[PDB]
Design a protein around this ligand. Structure first.
Ligand SMILES: [Zn+2]
Ligand SMILES: [Zn+2]
Length: 298
């Protein structure tokens, strides 16, 4: 029997949506298949929603709760930005300073009110944007990070967040990956069951540039990049790029604020960080969509 693969869209601090989805998934999938499933969280665990802390608590608990599952946690643009503010990103491997990332977006500083509190000098651009105060509705910053601060019991933009975030959560953020690759997953098509490669990346992959070169920087976590298009892009990462456009690779992403299935391109982000929208997961091989808003039993 083919292994069950669950790909979970953006959570954005909605603990109730995360819990209800997890509970629904256990009625849609039989106990044996669920217990040994590959579970790929597609990123964006923080911001917008009110309970980031509880979300990360939940995700940390999963290895203990389900020892035979494989758990993959993609870094979203939001979580990369979160990790940046906490100073958890490794120094750029090219020897540059994290402050060098600011220059490209320097004209955005005034409107975005970038963090100028303690430790801003050694901070990645996205960390400074994340903890900024946007001139006005946004929750504190352009990243809607206000609710993340509050979920850990501190005001928005506070340097004290660094002390409030538990060590296990910092370890969780350090353990996130920018890409996940699988050699062999099953997926239903109109013609029948297929075996495919899988690439999981929060937003997607770029056109033009060699795919392996892209995957290389993603595997290595290059912090010299001001804005990581693979985590933050929109139209530029929507499509499967030329090199992978041959029906042998599933490319799964969250990020886009839409649930969109087009052949081998899976975009799983029905929630979009909105409080009134469902969080959806896709279950492979069947491609069935399970939501927090479901009321399932077996
Ligand atoms: Zn998102
Ligand atoms: Zn995103």
């Amino acid at each position: 029997k083919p292994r069950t693969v669950i790909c979970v869209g953006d959570i954005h601090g909605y603990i109730s949506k995360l819990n209800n989805l997890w509970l629904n998934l256990q009625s849609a999938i039989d106990p044996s298949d669920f217990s040994s499933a590959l579970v790929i969280f597609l990123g964006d665990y923080c911001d917008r929603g009110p309970e980031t802390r509880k979300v990360i608590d939940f995700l940390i608990s999963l290895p203990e709760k389900h020892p035979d599952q494989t758990h993959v946690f993609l870094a979203g643009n939001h979580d990369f930005a979160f990790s940046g503010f906490l100073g958890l990103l490794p120094r750029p491997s090219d020897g540059s300073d994290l402050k060098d990332t600011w220059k490209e977006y320097s004209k955005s500083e005034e409107t975005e009110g970038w963090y100028t509190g303690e430790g801003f000098e050694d901070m990645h651009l996205q960390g400074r944007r994340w903890a900024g105060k946007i001139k006005a509705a946004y929750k504190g910053s352009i990243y809607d990070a206000g609710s993340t601060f509050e979920s850990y019991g501190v005001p928005h933009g506070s340097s004290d967040l660094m002390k409030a975030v538990p060590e296990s959560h910092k370890k969780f953020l350090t353990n996130m990956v920018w890409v996940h690759e699988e050699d062999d997953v099953c997926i239903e098509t109109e013609e029948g069951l297929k075996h495919c490669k899988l690439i999981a990346v929060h937003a997607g992959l770029e056109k033009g540039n060699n795919v392996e070169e892209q995957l290389k920087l993603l595997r290595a976590k290059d912090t010299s990049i001001s804005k990581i298009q693979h985590l933050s892009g929109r139209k530029n990462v929507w499509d499967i790029p030329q090199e992978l456009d041959d029906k042998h690779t599933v490319v799964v992403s969250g990020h886009h604020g839409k649930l969109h299935i087009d052949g081998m391109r899976l975009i799983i982000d029905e929630g979009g960080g909105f409080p009134d929208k469902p969080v959806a997961a896709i279950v492979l091989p069947s491609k069935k969509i399970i939501r927090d808003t479901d009321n399932l039993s077996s």
